[PDB]
Paper text:
Since extensive initial crystallization attempts with wild-type UBA6 did not result in well diffracting crystals, a chimeric protein, referred to as UBA6chim, was utilized. In this protein the SCCH domain (residue 623 to 889) of UBA6 was replaced with its counterpart (residue 631 to 889) from human UBA1, resulting in a protein with enhanced stability. The overall structure of the UBA6chim-FAT10 C0 complex revealed that FAT10 covers the AAD, IAD and 3HB domains of UBA6chim and engages in numerous interactions distributed over a smaller and a larger interface involving the NTD and CTD, respectively. While T133 engages in limited van der Waals interactions involving its side chain Cβ and Cγ atoms, more prominent hydrophobic contacts are formed by L155, F157 and A159 of FAT10 with F316 in the IAD as well as F925, V934, and, to a more limited extent, T936, which are both located in the AAD. Second, the C-terminal tail of FAT10 is threaded underneath the crossover loop towards the ATP binding site with the C-terminal G165 being in close proximity to where the α-phosphate resides in the UBA6-ATP complex. The UBA6chim-FAT10 structure clearly revealed that the same binding pocket used by Uba1 to recognize R72 of ubiquitin is recruited for the binding of Y161 of FAT10. In contrast to the polar interactions involving the recognition of R72, Y161 is recognized predominantly by hydrophobic interactions involving H599 and H614, which are replaced by Asn and Ser (N574 and S589 in Uba1; N606 and S621 in UBA1). In contrast to the hypothesis that the NTD of FAT10 is placed in between the AAD and FCCH and interacts with these domains (see “Comparison of the UBA6 and Uba1 structures”), it is oriented in such a way that it exclusively interacts with the 3HB inserted into the IAD. These interactions are polar and primarily rely on the electrostatic complementarity of a positively charged region in the NTD involving residues K55, K58, R60 and K61 and a negatively charged patch in the 3HB formed by E320, E324, D370 and D374, with S64 of FAT10 and N318 of UBA6 contributing additional polar interactions.
The covalent modification of target proteins with ubiquitin or ubiquitin-like modifiers is initiated by E1 activating enzymes, which typically transfer a single modifier onto cognate conjugating enzymes. UBA6 is an unusual E1 since it activates two highly distinct modifiers, ubiquitin and FAT10. In the presence of Mg-ATP, E1 catalyzes the acyl-adenylation of ubiquitin, initially forming a ubiquitin-AMP adduct. Subsequently, the E1 catalytic cysteine attacks the ubiquitin-AMP intermediate to form a thioester bond between the cysteine and the C-terminal glycine of ubiquitin, resulting in the formation of a covalent E1~ubiquitin adduct.
Author numbering:
A (entry chain A): 52 to 797, 823 to 988, 992 to 1030, 1035 to 1050
B (entry chain C): 7 to 81, 87 to 165
Write the structure that this text describes.
């Protein structure tokens, strides 16, 4: 066969009409790697086009160049491996359509419906059929159409690589049960097809394709195996990809009976109503050779008449929606660049689906809208939406000058200059965000640099930019889109260390915050920061075809931290411990080890010293494994406690020998390499790999790298210093001697452990310091440990090594961004951003989870605020924070009383543990003065503390901020 | 602002404040406070035209009227719903209008193996949330419930 990428490399595309929409499509397609993209337009540039088109320039409008031919050079630069060809050939009923035969797909924008029909008829007639996609954006309303032909074959629906399964046994019968390895389960559907290869016994099944039915989980019936010989061992099955045929109808047939996907199920009949209106607009242009003028009652009425007439011609009758028609007549002359970017992304992906068959296509129509952006304006004045001659006239005709002015003065904080961030900046510039010199300021920050990429290459970044900061480069590139835009580019990462740089003042000055991140931790840190300063947050994510948008407004919605996360799929326990097959296994095992060595032991010991009841809690927990925790504590306390960095180094050398030689050798003693399983098949077969233990070498850098990282980290856990001297560790390692290994064939002690364990009083001022993992900071050694630990484990199981950069990406499970999804997500996030700057109600804001592979777009209203109340108290949102002003001389009792006196609820305890009733000397803690009780050590004006009220158990409360001085 | 009048064969005339932009559902909620209570009974009509609940008064061409009037009328508790998976994996579940939201999430847990506490579903474009009833959300036969997983990248 030929791959989806190979198919794009052989395929040519024809795009007509180069407004904002035609460009957005061309951009994404050329970045994707289409062999040839033939741009075509007939009109010459105009000052209005500067608002919609991000490559056009003031110079081009004066010279009256053809829209396409002015932007061809800037588009071709995007992807130099693609042949972009311009065309000015006039398009009429006269013009022959024979020149379109060469193109595999044809995309039409800004074209009459009659001419579009004629082309559609020609495209679907040809053999093989030429695929047809029509997209237009008039005002805040859009239309998208797909007609790939009467029959279209989708070669790959899931878009995933075919699965491989390992067979434990096949019964000889008709329905002969086939059961997979107990270790390796299969997720198969009752209709799927498998091809079996390298089976023992049933030699006939090696070249056969059988349908399988899963009547019982983890088993299936392939067919009649009674004739065939009996199965012994082995048997790998490969999923067979089966094409899915979807049928299409011509444009003329679909207008009369449209088949639209529903974006928002709240308004299920909304797409058909839009179809009626959009089709009326086309008739209005045909009858009067112009678009409806804004605020003209005659035009708005005539359109409603047409829409009323069309509603009769439609199959299901629908009832016309007057609100939609009215808004269409007003905005018909305008162009909303973010909606265009969103429609552009989707439309683009459909083209790829047509030349590749990589996903199931759109079924005919898709109507997207920004009605939520205008509905909240009520019934506004028509004078607002009149053109003033500037570049933003197109936007003004959609949202009115009032909201345009709010955007111009905005102060946005863009966290992350990745693919989403770069698109966001282009969407900002067309919208005119932060273009007013007096007030507006966009602040964008990203700490990373640019990479060669070559594939999945970004449109702002170019080759000569390689190894130059992302944010700086984008900012400089963005100004070329809109000169008036004001951007403050920074290289600082948004994390606790920079909280001084991005202080509470900064967040309060910023009117909106937008996140373009790839890790959840940073999302939570930004969400928390925005909650304290009571500012909104706009999050987005891209995972291949899938994307998501979450809008968080102050006091109207919940936060990102509230929204909880499901556990990711777990690599089978035991497969990670003893049978790794891939670098993904060793990398994950190292992270499992890191927490099991440098974090969890330290917390267990610190918990033993702090809690006198720790001993009871652990006895109660998980019988038969309290012994394991207890012995692990006594080991860290006594046996393995290092008093010197050399003791840390010896512990690293002894640990390296146990994980990569002794533990291996005992597994081999249990499961020797010659050993065979039931059915006389080798045990180290297929997914299982025979390891070979390693021998420590000072000269080998992997061996040294492990010791050097482990010891410096081990020292941190106990508070010791580290030296970081390789030669010193090397020479010393020769001197140390390691205990010999002996493999093994295979509660009175638990009482002994209770006695042996040193009582906490006996160990004074001893504390251990858990380490939390941070990939970013390479001077930590945190990542250095992981890379070594994985690559060394790979050596043992004959798995290929993993570089630093490769391993980092594998650990992040980061997916390369795709231009279709990012452009879509970024347009939607931009649209919501308009609603926020307007201060719109909760109802207007709508989140969105989309997947272009299906395709399905889901619009949902945002999650409402959830107020939490304690018995006989007032309810408090997440956004609320309680503030207490004190005197310089105060007590915790005088505070607790003051809490009940203001709000009507009194705290049982207070955390920063500062005071518990159960704690001994609770009357001492309650008499303590406030400056002695809490020591900021910076004589801070205020201190933030937690509060809890118990009606059974204690229940949290909203954060409390106390001011030492009333002032 | 507006005043809306409701004529009923077996019930008293109802007059209350209203807004043209507000939905017919909002009018039915306004009716509930003044008389009869709940909207499930209500099936509003004007002349010969049926009035859909989601559509606004302005969607039916109401304009330049200080006050408007409508003729209210009264007309399968267990229904079939199909629950869409994270990756093109539909399921069949039976629900009733009088079902607690947690009960329905528990059905998803058996079907998908996803704990109901952390389940994320969207029904008729409204996030499916705890402490609610299916009737409150508004459910009709043939509706679809969508399961979603959050995406990270870019």
């Amino acid at each position: 066969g030929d791959t989806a990428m190979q198919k794009m490399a052989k395929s040519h595309v024809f795009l007509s009409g180069m407004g904002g929409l035609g460009l957005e499509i061309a951009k994404n397609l050329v970045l994707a790697g289409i062999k040839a993209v033939t741009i075509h337009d007939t009109e010459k540039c105009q000052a209005w086009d500067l608002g919609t088109n991000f490559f056009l320039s003031e110079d081009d409008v004066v010279n009256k160049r053809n829209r396409a031919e002015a932007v061809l050079k800037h588009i071709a630069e995007l992807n130099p491996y693609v042949h972009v060809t311009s065309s000015s050939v006039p398009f009429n009923e006269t013009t022959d359509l024979s020149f379109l035969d060469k193109y595999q797909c044809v995309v039409l924008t800004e074209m009459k419906l009659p001419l579009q029909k004629k082309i559609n008829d020609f495209c679907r007639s040809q053999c093989p059929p030429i695929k047809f996609i029509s997209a237009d954006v008039h005002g805040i309303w859009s239309r998208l159409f797909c007609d790939f032909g009467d029959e279209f074959e989708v070669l790959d629906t899931t878009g995933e690589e075919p699965k491989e399964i390992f067979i434990s046994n096949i019964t000889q019968a008709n329905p002969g049960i086939v059961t997979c390895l107990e270790n390796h389960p299969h997720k198969l559907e009752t209709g799927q097809f498998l091809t079996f290869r390298e089976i023992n016994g049933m030699t006939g099944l090696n070249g056969s394709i059988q349908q399988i039915t899963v009547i019982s989980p983890f088993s299936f019936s392939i067919g009649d195996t009674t004739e065939l010989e009996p199965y012994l061992h082995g048997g790998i099955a490969v999923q067979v990809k089966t094409p899915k045929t979807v049928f299409f109808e011509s444009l003329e047939r679909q207008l009369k009976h449209p088949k639209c996907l529903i974006v928002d199920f709240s308004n299920p009949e909304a797409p058909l109503e839009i179809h009626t209106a959009m089709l009326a607009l086309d008739q209005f242009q045909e009858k009067y050779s112009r678009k409806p003028n804004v605020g003209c009652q005659q035009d708005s009425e005539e359109l409603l008449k047409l829409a009323t007439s069309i509603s009769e011609t439609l199959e299901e009758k629908p009832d016309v929606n007057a609100d939609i028609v009215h808004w269409l007549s007003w905005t018909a002359q305008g162009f909303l660049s973010p909606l265009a970017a969103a429609v552009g992304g989707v439309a683009s992906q459909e083209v790829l689906k047509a030349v590749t068959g990589k996903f199931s296509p759109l079924c005919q129509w898709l109507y997207l809208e920004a009605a939520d952006i205008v509905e909240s304006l009520g019934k506004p004045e028509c004078e607002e939406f009149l053109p003033r001659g500037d570049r933003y006239d197109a936007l003004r005709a959609c949202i009115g000058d009032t909201l345009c002015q709010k955007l111009q003065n905005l102060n946005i904080f863009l966290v992350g200059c990745g693919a989403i961030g770069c698109e966001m900046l282009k969407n900002f510039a067309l919208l005119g965000v932060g273009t007013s010199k007096e007030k507006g300021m966009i602040t964008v920050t990203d700490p990373d640099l640019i990479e060669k990429s070559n594939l999945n290459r970004q449109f702002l970044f170019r080759p000569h930019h390689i190894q130059k900061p992302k944010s700086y480069t984008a900012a400089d590139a963005t100004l070329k889109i809109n000169s008036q835009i004001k951007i403050d580019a920074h290289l600082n990462k948004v994390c606790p260390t920079t909280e001084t740089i991005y202080n509470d003042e900064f967040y309060t000055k910023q009117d909106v915050i937008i996140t373009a991140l790839d890790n959840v931790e940073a999302r939570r840190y930004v969400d928390s920061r925005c909650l304290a300063n009571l500012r909104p947050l706009l999050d987005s994510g891209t995972m291949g075809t899938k994307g998501h948008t979450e809008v968080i407004v102050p006091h109207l919605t919940e936060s990102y931290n509230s929204h909880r996360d499901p556990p990711e799929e777990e690599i089978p326990i035991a497969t990670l411990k003893n049978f790794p097959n891939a670098i993904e296994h060793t990398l994950q095992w190292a992270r499992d080890e890191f927490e099991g060595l440098f974090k969890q032991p330290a917390e267990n010991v610190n918990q033993y010293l702090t809690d006198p009841k720790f001993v009871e809690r652990t006895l109660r927990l998980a019988g038969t494994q309290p012994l394991e925790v207890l012995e692990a504590v006594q080991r860290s306390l006594v046996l393995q406690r290092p008093q010197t960095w050399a003791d840390c180094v010896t512990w690293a050398c002894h640990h390296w020998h146990t994980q990569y030689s002794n533990n291996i050798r005992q597994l081999l003693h249990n499961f020797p390499p010659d050993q065979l399983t039931s059915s006389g098949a080798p045990f180290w077969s297929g997914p299982k790999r025979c390891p070979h233990p390693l021998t420590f070498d000072v000269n080998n850098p992997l061996h040294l790298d492990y010791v050097m990282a482990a010891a410096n980290l081990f020292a941190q856990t106990y508070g010791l210093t580290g030296s970081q001297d390789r030669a010193a560790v090397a020479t010393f390692l020769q001197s140390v001697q390691v205990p010999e290994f002996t493999p093994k064939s295979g509660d009175s002690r638990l009482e002994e452990l209770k006695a042996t364990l040193p009582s906490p009083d006996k160990l004074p001022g001893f504390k251990m310091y858990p380490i939390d993992f941070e990939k970013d900071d390479d001077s930590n050694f945190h990542m250095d440990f992981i890379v070594a630990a994985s690559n060394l484990r790979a050596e043992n199981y004959d798995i290929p090594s993993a570089d630093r950069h490769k391993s980092k990406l594998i650990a992040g499970k980061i997916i390369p961004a795709i231009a279709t999804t990012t452009a879509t997500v970024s347009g939607l996030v931009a649209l919501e951003m308009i609603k926020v700057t307007g201060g719109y109600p909760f109802e207007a804001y709508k989140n969105c989870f989309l997947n272009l592979a299906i395709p399905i777009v889901v619009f949902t209203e945002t999650t409402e605020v959830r107020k939490t109340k304690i018995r006989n108290g007032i309810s408090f949102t997440i956004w609320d924070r309680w503030t207490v002003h004190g005197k310089e001389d105060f007590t915790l009792l005088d505070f607790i009383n003051a809490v009940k006196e203001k709000y009507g609820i009194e705290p049982t305890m207070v955390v920063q543990m500062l005071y518990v009733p159960v704690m001994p000397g609770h009357a001492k803690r309650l008499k303590l003065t406030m400056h002695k009780l809490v020591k900021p050590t910076t004589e801070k004006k205020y201190v933030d503390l937690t509060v809890s009220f118990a009606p059974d158990e204690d229940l949290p409360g909203p954060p409390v901020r106390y001011y030492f001085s009333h002032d | 602002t507006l005043t809306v009048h409701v004529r009923s064969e077996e019930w008293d005339l109802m007059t209350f404040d209203a807004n043209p932009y507000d939905s017919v559902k909002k009018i039915k909620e306004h009716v509930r406070s003044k008389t009869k209570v709940p909207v499930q009974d209500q099936v509003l009509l004007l002349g010969s035209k049926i009035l859909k609940p989601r559509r606004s008064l302005s969607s039916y061409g109401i304009d330049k009227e200080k006050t408007i009037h409508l003729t209210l009328k009264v007309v399968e508790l267990p229904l079939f719903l199909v629950e869409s998976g994270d990756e093109a994996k539909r399921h069949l579940l039976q629900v009733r209008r009088s079902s607690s939201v947690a009960q329905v999430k528990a059905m998803i847990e058996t079907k998908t193996g996803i704990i109901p506490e952390t389940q994320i579903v969207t029904l008729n474009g409204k996030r499916l949330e705890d402490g609610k009833m299916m009737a409150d959300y508004g459910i009709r036969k043939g509706n679809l419930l969508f399961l979603a997983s959050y995406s990270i990248g870019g």
